[PDB]
Design a protein around this ligand. Structure first.
Ligand SMILES: [Zn+2]
Lengths: 49, 178, 49, 359
């Protein structure tokens, strides 16, 4: 999670259009946060394992 | 009986057929009180100041009149429009007048919480303040729709005759009295 | 469309989660790009003692 | 079987001592004296029959699924909304309608679905995606609901606040919100609940858009939790720090609630002695909310079982006159018409030629 994933993301970092040249989408960083539980109200909180 | 009030009438709608085909361009050109868009629409629009109303006259001879406060006022306005067409030269005639719609309103002098109405009359009640503040009630007898407001004010629509408006009022009174 | 599409109308999130959770729960994968489809990779943790 | 050996049994139920299958019967406390060995499955290894569907219809289905996966919510919402889409795609007008109406349809279906499971959501969040417009999708919603006659709950007031208040960035420090701006969610949400309970019973919410009410309540609750650091803020100055946009009616609700609290304050001497106003009352609500019900019944003029009016604002302006009996009347519309009025509505040939020249 700390390093390898960063390299994997770097290895593939941009996607370009079929038309409209120079139209592309770019990643710049990737994050993982920390564990939490989803809720039915589009809300979350941390929870012990 | 109700709480001392019977609904007022807001608007009237009626239809008459002039009995002959009309050149709308001629009517628009010569009528001071008319407006027409031949490139866009198949009927002319005219106005009179007493009874203060308007008429929509189609090239096929059909007509729709609006704005009157009563059936007799609408009929008088329709007759005045028929006379207007007659003096324009066409063989217009007053046949098959029919009142098509009627609108009324009333107030009960006390506020009403619409949420209870919607929560107890779901099958007739619509309440979407984010779309329109007032509550809508689909009454089945007579075939009338009532528009209700938190102020205690109510509007009625869809009647062919006044008895329908007042029957709807006296039918909704015991419900809103709760 | 006569005006440009916006990616937010189509960019979804569940595919990665589905792949990850099913892959770990089932304990068998299909690395068809690398032509490996190994199985029996994960086992319940025993708790007898 | 059916019978016991001879007499009146007709029922069959299972029982068995040990790993067997025997058919209990209940005219004799018996087993139909027969039993039969159950046959079963397993140790190997919801329909198909899938209609090919019209191409544009399944295009619509694909849009349906792609939409609600935005909410990353339980697939059951997906499946039931899809079922509703199939139920709707059975009518000529729906088939013949332009595709924009179908697109807003794929959103209204999810709206009703979420309402059935009272899952919080608001129109704007949905319509930001569908290229929708208020008239378009609102009219389509009314049409569909009144066509299908389906029942659906309303937006509960407290339902939306839970997710809305959690969306604020006030609960942790940031360069936009130093500690003097940071606040604990529990306290402010309790205050906002204590405020919305006041809002409805004061008729404030009925007939209005609620989110302005929530915005004003949250802004004032946050202010009064640390007013010395917060009375200097402003609606926009607040909402921009948490990356929030505010209604213009938020100010209207703020004025309404400020009037309400100034009406509340005069009922207690140890609040009246401070001569409270708009500037000062904000920091005192912490004291007012401890006696709210007492303030209400000392403040409303409507002391009947069923000093100031506790009536909806639309009448608090007072009628100019209190709806005297309407003039229900009729007229003799059979009279002869004055031709002069008819002729006045006609252009002279001079005016006709003027119109021709102008045209
Ligand atoms: Zn027996």
């Amino acid at each position: 999670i700390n390093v390898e994933i960063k390299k994997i993301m770097k290895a593939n970092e941009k996607v370009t259009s079929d038309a409209d040249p120079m139209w592309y989408l770019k990643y710049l960083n990737i994050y993982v946060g920390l564990p939490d539980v989803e809720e039915s109200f589009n809300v979350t909180r941390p929870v012990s394992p | 009986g109700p709480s001392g009030i019977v609904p007022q009438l807001q608007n009237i709608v009626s239809t008459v057929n002039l009995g002959c085909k009309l050149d709308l361009k001629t009517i628009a050109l010569r009528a001071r009180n008319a407006e027409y868009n031949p490139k866009r629409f198949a009927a002319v629009i005219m106005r009179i100041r007493e009874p203060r109303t308007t008429a929509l006259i189609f090239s096929s001879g059909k007509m729709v009149c609006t704005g009157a406060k009563s059936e007799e006022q609408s009929r008088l306005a329709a007759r005045k429009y028929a006379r207007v067409v007659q003096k324009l030269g066409f063989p217009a005639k007053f046949l098959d007048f029919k009142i098509q719609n009627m609108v009324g309103s009333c107030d009960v002098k006390f506020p009403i919480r619409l949420e209870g109405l919607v929560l107890t009359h779901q099958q007739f009640s619509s309440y979407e303040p984010e779309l329109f503040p007032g509550l809508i009630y689909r009454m089945i007898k007579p075939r009338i729709v009532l528009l209700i407001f938190v102020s205690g004010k109510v509007v009625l629509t869809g009647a062919k005759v006044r008895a329908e408006i007042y029957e709807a009022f006296e039918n909704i009174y015991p419900i809103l009295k709760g | 469309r006569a005006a440009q599409f916006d990616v937010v109308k189509h960019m979804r999130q569940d595919q990665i989660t589905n792949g990850m959770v099913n892959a770990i729960s089932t304990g068998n994968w299909s690395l068809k790009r690398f032509k490996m489809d190994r199985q029996g990779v994960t086992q319940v943790l025993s708790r007898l003692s | 079987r059916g019978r016991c050996p001879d007499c009146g049994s007709t029922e069959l139920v299972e029982d068995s001592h040990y790993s067997q299958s025997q058919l209990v019967c209940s005219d004799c406390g018996c087993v139909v004296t027969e039993g039969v060995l159950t046959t079963t499955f397993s140790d190997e290894g919801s329909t198909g029959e899938n209609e090919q569907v019209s191409r544009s219809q399944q295009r619509g289905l694909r849009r349906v699924r792609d939409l609600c996966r935005v909410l990353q919510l339980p697939p059951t919402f997906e499946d039931t909304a899809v079922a509703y889409y199939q139920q709707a795609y059975r009518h000529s007008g729906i088939r013949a309608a332009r595709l924009q109406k179908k697109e807003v349809l794929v959103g209204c279906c999810v709206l009703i679905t979420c309402r059935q499971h009272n899952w919080p959501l608001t129109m704007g969040a949905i319509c930001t995606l569908l290229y929708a417009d208020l008239d378009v999708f609102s009219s389509t919603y009314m049409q569909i609901v009144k066509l299908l006659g389906l029942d659906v709950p309303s937006l509960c007031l407290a339902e939306l606040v839970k997710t809305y208040c959690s969306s604020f960035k006030l609960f942790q420090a940031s360069p936009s919100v130093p500690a003097k701006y940071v606040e604990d969610k529990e306290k402010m949400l309790s205050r906002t609940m204590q405020l919305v309970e006041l809002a409805n019973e004061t008729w404030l919410v009925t007939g209005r858009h609620p989110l302005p009410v929530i915005t004003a309540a949250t802004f004032l609750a946050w202010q009064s939790l640390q007013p010395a650091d917060r009375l200097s803020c402003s609606l926009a100055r607040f909402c921009k720090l948490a990356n929030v946009d505010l209604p213009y009616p938020a100010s209207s609700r703020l004025q309404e609630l400020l009037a309400v609290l100034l009406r509340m304050a005069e009922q207690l001497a140890w609040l009246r002695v401070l001569r409270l106003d708009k500037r000062s009352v904000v920091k005192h609500i912490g004291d007012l909310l401890q006696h709210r019900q007492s303030l209400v019944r000392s403040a409303f003029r409507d002391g009947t079982a069923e000093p100031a009016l506790l009536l909806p604002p639309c009448m608090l302006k007072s009628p100019k006159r209190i709806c005297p009996v309407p003039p229900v009347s009729t007229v003799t519309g059979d009279e002869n018409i004055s031709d002069s009025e008819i002729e006045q509505y006609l252009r002279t040939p001079q005016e006709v030629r003027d119109f021709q020249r102008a045209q």
